[PDB]
């Protein structure tokens, strides 16, 4: 027999993702760059891989979209919410949205959306919010350069899968 797991997470340490639109702001390149390096934050501190998929179904499926966009979470148009993603778990579980009436950045104008991808990803694994205000998790969104994670964040997603090669 098994019982239901103690706490919501991944029962697998490969997971996938699919960029399955993308916003008007970036380059298909910049917005690629910008998930790659917001997966490698928590593969870098856990036993987690992130593989990448072009076409099909994908553990962690990434949009951009507006207003009511297929669930119950509508966005609302610019301000307000900016994304947000699913605990994980089958289906919409894992998912990650972005609220294409937002001006995504590679940069500190508008919302960075490596940064905010990180974040969610965080919800994708996982995590809720955090009361550090120095948390990646905190639930207010703040942007210097040199991303380094947040000791909070870390014991956070250390204590779901455990931290993997701890000098890699
Ligand atoms: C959609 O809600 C979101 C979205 C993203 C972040 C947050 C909250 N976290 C921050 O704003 C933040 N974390 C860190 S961790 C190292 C630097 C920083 C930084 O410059 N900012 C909330
Ligand atoms: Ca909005
Ligand atoms: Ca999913
Ligand atoms: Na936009
Ligand atoms: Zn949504
Ligand atoms: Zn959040």
């Known amino acids: 027999y098994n019982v239901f797991p103690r706490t919501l997470k991944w029962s697998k340490m490969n997971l996938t993702y699919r960029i399955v639109n993308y916003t008007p702001d ?7 760059k910008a998930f790659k390096k917001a997966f490698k934050v928590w593969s870098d501190v856990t036993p987690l891989n992130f593989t990448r998929l072009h076409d099909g ?13 297929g669930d119950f979470y509508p966005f609302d148009g610019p301000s307000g919410l900016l994304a947000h993603a699913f605990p994980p ?4 579980g894992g998912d990650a949205h972005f609220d294409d009436d937002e001006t995504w950045t590679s940069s500190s104008k508008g919302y960075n959306l490596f940064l905010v991808a990180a974040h969610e990803f965080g919800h994708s694994l996982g995590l809720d919010h955090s009361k550090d205000p120095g948390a990646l998790m905190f639930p207010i969104y703040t942007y210097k350069s040199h991303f380094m994670l947040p000791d909070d964040d870390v014991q956070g997603i250390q204590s779901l899968y455990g931290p993997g090669d701890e000098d890699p």
Do not use: C, L, Q
């Open 89 to 92: 778990g089958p289906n919409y």
């Open 26 to 32: 970036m380059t298909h390149s910049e917005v690629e």
């Open 57 to 69: 179904i994908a553990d962690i499926m990434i949009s951009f979209g507006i207003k009511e966009h």
